[PDB]
Design a protein around this nucleic acid. Structure first.
Lengths: 114, 56, 121, 120, 209
RNA sequence: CGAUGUCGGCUCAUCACAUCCUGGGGCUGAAGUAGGUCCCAAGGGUAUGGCUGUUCGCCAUUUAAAGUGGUACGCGAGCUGGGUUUAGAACGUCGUGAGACAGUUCGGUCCCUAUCUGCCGUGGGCGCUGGAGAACUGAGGGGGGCUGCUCCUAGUACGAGAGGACCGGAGUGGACGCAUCACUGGUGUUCGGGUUGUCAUGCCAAUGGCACUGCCCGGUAGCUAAAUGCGGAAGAGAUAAGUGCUGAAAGCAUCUAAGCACGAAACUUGCCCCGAGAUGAGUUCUCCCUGACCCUUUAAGGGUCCUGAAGGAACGUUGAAGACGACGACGUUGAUAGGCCGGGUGUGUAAGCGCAGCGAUGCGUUGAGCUAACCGGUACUAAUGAACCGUGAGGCUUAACCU
RNA sequence: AAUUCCUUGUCGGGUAAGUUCCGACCUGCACGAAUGGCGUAAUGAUGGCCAGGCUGUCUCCACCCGAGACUCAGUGAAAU
RNA sequence: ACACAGGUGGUCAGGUAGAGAAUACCAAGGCGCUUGAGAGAACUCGGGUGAAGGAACUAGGCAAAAUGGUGCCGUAACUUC
RNA sequence: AGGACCGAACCGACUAAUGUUGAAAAAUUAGCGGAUGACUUGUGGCUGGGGGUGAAAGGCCAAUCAAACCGGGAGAUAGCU
């Protein structure tokens, strides 16, 4: 509809960088332990969506302490304050699930258009 | 799955009370030709309401 | 997560693999996500620890393959279910170190004691 | 049930539906007016009109696409040479569907589907 | 305390500053026009007749046109009623109708339900399907026993069987309003509301709250 | 006995109260926490596994609780076929033997297309007293009724200590139900890509057919739960057991005989839904039709000409509506569907050309090409003008306001 | 024990929990030596038990592809 | 019984992949199985795919799912070797 | 070499589902066993009813077998319906 996304346009944020699947981005999220608010870093390889509006969610993957952790994040949430691309990647898929379950296998890096 | 008593002609008639055909009760007459046809249908002379749309 | 679910063990003293035999709380409870306490049997035991094979006790699920849901709409998904073995009567953790991540909804009293030894939260 | 769903199953499997739509589109492009059943014609609009819209733009890629559909180079030549140059100004609505009577063996509501600018 | 008639637009999310991500649905509530006011003398009760939207004046018949033209002419999509005990309303329309919901906190939304159609027992009720492998000749999703042998001799009058599921007026209670937009003509309540998009909704303040 | 299918399990229930939990009280050898026993109460709830064919039982682990029964020891024209209970075979035992056993052991065909009652839904006809379009009141009828833990009251009252409340607030759960697809996901054989074997399009290139959609990798809309919102209460009226005030019969005593006040999840409400065929057929608002005659037993009508109104129906394009009817949107005064245009999405850098390399292949053009069911527009195609039904002021008696 | 009524005998193993199973004891109701006793490699669409993998068997179902069911036209039964 | 998914001896044996007379697509050749048309309910039949769990189902892993080929390494108790 | 191994033709019939007025008076689909031998199969012949034949089940002897079919004794008899 047209009444829908008139609210969502005001609820977007314009500071989202451009990501591709295969990029190992660093997501800084907000965490509240007590009365204080703190930034937590979560770096990992992205298995993304394309921008569905306000309902856009990207899935990143980190092998933390020997256990692989997959965390989605809404790309318009106030919890995520900044995302940084870090090292880029050259893969041929929009979804990298078969390349996320395996371990010890890495994605190569493209210089341009990735 | 079988009956225990025979249904009668009265019960047969009340069952067939809804098995009755309904006629068209309305036939449109075309403008270019005066021959009648079913509504929203070709006249079988090849004519729809504006022109002879079908040669056959 | 469910009955007959084999979970790995996070702490050092609680050993190897454990089968969940009951989810506690509630009359006909089907599932156990993270912050709740299940009953276990010990199917594999490392030879050293105070844990022995075939011992019934309690455990709190520190990792789940389905994961938890943050209120902002996001989920944290792991590969593999894990638990920390607790005492049966006092419900305190048995081991001295917790291996692997432990999610923030273990934020209450004994689970705060689990955060005090967990590496990444 | 089926909510917000399109297409007709037409009492056939998918490969048969694709093949019969291919042959029906080829027959319509060749003869410019064919008589079929009503739902077959109603799906024939949805398969034929993208082919004419693709025939509007002349390129080797569009000819290979409209050979991947309809699989007939005579249909491809007639389409990209005479159907779309003819409908070049017209934006939509290349097929007109006129209802006819019923078949004799079974009462199937028939319909004539025909190109709107017929050469004959 | 009366309510008003809206239309279901869809479902979105409202990101709060804390990060709560409240699931909302949007009800497009235009200017409701009071058409007829009922009183205790002419009728046996006390309520008002409202209308919303507009019609094309070719689908408006002569009785509908006469009823609308009586005391303030504007054709609407339909007519509804709202009971009242201590409120008094005029017979002209409401200018900004949604602003009577800016003070309420919990509303109670009513709309039609989506039609599932002729549905089985497993879809309609939460009936248990029987076994899929161990024998089970032609009896996977069938109803099981429907009665109690000869001593009743009959199936009881409330028996759960297969039938039409959907197209029922479903009233969902105690929903939190998060935003009332006067100039946008919108009312944002939290969570799930009956109907597809484009269905006619009835919002009222909550009887429970 | 010209046939009423047997135990147990699956699915589905419904009733009784001789109450397992929750609710309300009397007594206690009832300090508190906990109990024991008895009275009232059926509104809701009342496990998962190991063994056994098992009901049962023992056991493990929960729960507030894991009730006792009736219904052909409920339910085989609903399911199973482990048990029992045909024909094969064996062991122990009996018999000379054929054979036999409430013994044991391995294997052993479970049919029916629903006429009637009965329920689950959905229509057609007529009635409702002129004909229609709607909005309703509510006599009835159903649905729902469960409950744990933590904190404050408060380590307070009580108790030597140990321990530890009633009463009253608040948060968060388990089971269940209703709705929904915004999130997380599933499917998505109508979207895109990779790849194998073969055949064809004259051949390279590029495509298509078949091999479960050939095999996969993702995926839009819809549908969905594992996902997300919400909900069973608060509050009245009358009460059961119980507790009383006043008060005689019976100078006292007594909840009772007169009078009066409390008292439960049970009853009637309150919350949600169906509901005027509620023949007792209801109420309100609006719209529409106010012409000539002829024949005639005249508790009354019949026929002709002119007129067909409001509205409905038929037909067509159709829908988050639907088995068919029904319901809803629209019918050129139009966005009802298809097409087209723009986006979104989803695959993931199309074809052709050029460069590098011996070649597979890599790179530029290029986030390119294609894209459904989605969103916003656009009369290009189909929704033709008619035609059909429905009439012409709507009975009698009695009474009020007029006249 | 294809044999044992009491019997789910008693003890041990396996399981969180084992009337079945495996190993023992002998109290053989009512084993036993060509009506063959005991053992055994290989074999078995043979009977019982456990483990790995695997999964809609199941927790608990959800969607989809086709053939019927449903509507229309032609023909047109049956038990009772 | 039937223009009946059953039964019926021998002979020939093309291409590609393949050990093959298996199997997939095809040659020569023969067919589209003698009721159709719509719609896309429950329910039944035959299949496809499933979050998390993995036999908790059940008389019983019934049924489905799983592994599957060639070359090489390597292989236990027992044994009539 | 082998009543040897894997596996099509061929022969068989262990499990499940479907069908049960069936497509069929025992089949189909998906798996299953043997597949150089006590194999399998074509043509003709022989064994006859208290009889034949049987790697034995009261199995088979023309959809029929603890005594086939056909005709006769025969309108057996029936204290039963």
């Amino acid at each position: 509809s047209n009444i829908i996304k008139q609210l969502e346009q005001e609820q977007m944020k314009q500071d989202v960088p451009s990501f591709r699947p295969g990029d190992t981005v660093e997501v800084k999220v907000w965490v509240v332990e007590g009365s204080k608010k703190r930034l937590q870093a979560f770096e990992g390889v992205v298995i993304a969506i394309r921008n569905r509006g306000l309902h856009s969610a990207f899935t990143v993957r980190k092998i933390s302490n020997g256990e692989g952790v997959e965390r989605v994040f809404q790309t318009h949430s106030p919890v995520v304050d900044s995302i940084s691309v870090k090292r880029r990647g050259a893969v041929r898929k929009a979804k990298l699930y078969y390349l996320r379950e395996r371990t010890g296998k890495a994605a190569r890096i493209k210089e341009r258009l990735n | 799955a079988v009956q225990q008593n025979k249904p009668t002609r009265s019960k047969r008639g009340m069952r067939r009370s809804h098995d009755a055909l309904t006629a068209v009760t309305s036939l449109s007459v075309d403008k270019t030709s005066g021959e009648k046809h079913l509504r929203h249908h070709i006249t079988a002379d090849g004519y729809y309401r504006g022109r002879k749309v079908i040669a056959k | 997560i469910q009955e007959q679910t084999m979970l790995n063990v996070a702490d050092n003293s609680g050993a190897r693999r454990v089968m969940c035999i009951k989810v506690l709380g509630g009359s006909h409870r089907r599932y156990a996500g993270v912050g709740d306490i299940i009953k276990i049997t010990i199917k594999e035991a490392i030879p050293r620890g105070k844990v022995k094979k075939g011992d019934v006790l309690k455990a709190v699920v520190v990792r789940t393959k389905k994961g938890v849901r943050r209120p902002d709409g996001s989920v944290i998904r792991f590969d593999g279910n894990a638990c920390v073995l607790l005492n049966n009567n006092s419900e305190q953790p048995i081991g001295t170190r917790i291996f692997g991540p432990v999610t923030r909804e273990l934020r209450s009293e004994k689970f705060m004691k689990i955060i005090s030894l967990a590496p990444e939260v | 049930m089926r909510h917000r769903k399109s297409g007709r199953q037409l009492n056939r499997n998918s490969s048969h539906r694709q093949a019969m739509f291919r042959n029906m589109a080829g027959s319509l492009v060749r003869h410019e007016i064919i008589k079929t059943t009503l739902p077959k014609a109603k799906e024939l609009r949805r398969v034929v009109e993208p082919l004419i819209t693709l025939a509007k733009t002349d390129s080797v890629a569009n000819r290979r696409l409209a050979f991947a559909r309809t699989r007939d180079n005579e249909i491809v030549a007639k389409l990209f040479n005479e159907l779309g140059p003819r409908f070049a100004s017209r934006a939509g609505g290349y097929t007109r569907i006129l209802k006819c009577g019923f078949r004799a063996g079974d009462n199937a509501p028939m319909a004539y589907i025909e190109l709107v600018d017929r050469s004959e | 305390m009366i309510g008003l008639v809206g239309k279901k637009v869809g479902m979105t999310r409202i990101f709060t500053e804390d990060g709560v991500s409240i699931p909302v649905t949007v009800i497009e509530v235009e200017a409701n026009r009071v058409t007829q006011v009922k009183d205790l003398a002419n009728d046996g009760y006390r309520a008002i007749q409202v209308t919303t939207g507009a019609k094309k004046a070719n689908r408006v018949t002569k009785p509908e046109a006469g009823h609308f033209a009586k005391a303030g002419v504007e054709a609407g999509r339909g007519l509804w009623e709202f009971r009242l005990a201590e409120g008094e309303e005029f017979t002209v329309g409401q200018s900004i109708s949604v602003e009577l919901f800016a003070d309420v906190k919990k509303v109670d939304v009513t709309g039609t339900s989506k039609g599932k159609g002729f549905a089985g027992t497993v879809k309609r009720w939460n009936f248990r399907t029987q076994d899929a492998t161990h024998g089970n000749s032609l009896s996977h999703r069938v109803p099981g026993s429907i009665g109690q042998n000869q001593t009743p001799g009959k199936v009881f009058k409330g028996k759960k069987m297969a039938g039409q599921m959907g197209n029922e007026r479903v009233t969902v209670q105690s929903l939190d309003v998060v935003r009332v937009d006067a100039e946008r003509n919108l009312l944002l309540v939290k969570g799930a509301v009956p109907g597809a998009t484009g269905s006619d909704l009835i919002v009222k303040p909550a009887v429970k709250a």
